Write a protein that binds this ligand. Structure first.
Ligand SMILES: O=C1CC[C@H](N2C(=O)c3ccccc3C2=O)C(=O)N1
Ligand SMILES: [Zn+2]
Length: 105
């Protein structure tokens, strides 16, 4: 249990070693304006995503960061968001925990 893959298709996405404690915890539970709850795991790094459009600050869960939707680059599943335009770190990924599968490298 060291790498994270897209639950829907198996695309390689991230690694346990790349988890990022933002504000003291890599896990943040948040809601969007439609009331959907997301258990977000922050990672310093991810791969195999497709980042959609240009960044927006609207409703951002992380102060100082603008977001872009991150889809699985293979199957198009919404896996989370890429955050940028902030400070220490400038960028990171917030991925929806239950949309990933964890397993051996
Ligand atoms: O940091 C974030 C990422 C974007 C996220 N987001 C949503 O998941 C969403 C769904 C529908 C309409 C508008 C939004 C919105 O800004 C949100 O609420 N905060
Ligand atoms: Zn996928």
């Amino acid at each position: 249990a060291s790498i994270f893959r897209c639950r829907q298709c198996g695309q390689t996405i991230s690694r346990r070693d790349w988890l990022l404690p933002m504000g003291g915890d890599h896990e943040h539970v948040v809601f969007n304006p439609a009331g959907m709850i997301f258990r977000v795991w922050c990672f310093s790094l991810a791969q195999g995503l497709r980042l959609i459009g240009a960044p927006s600050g609207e409703f951002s869960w992380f102060k100082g960061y603008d977001w872009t939707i991150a889809l699985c680059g293979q199957c198009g599943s919404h896996l989370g968001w890429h955050y940028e335009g902030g400070s220490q770190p400038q960028t990171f990924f917030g991925l929806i925990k239950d949309r990933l599968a964890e397993g051996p490298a």
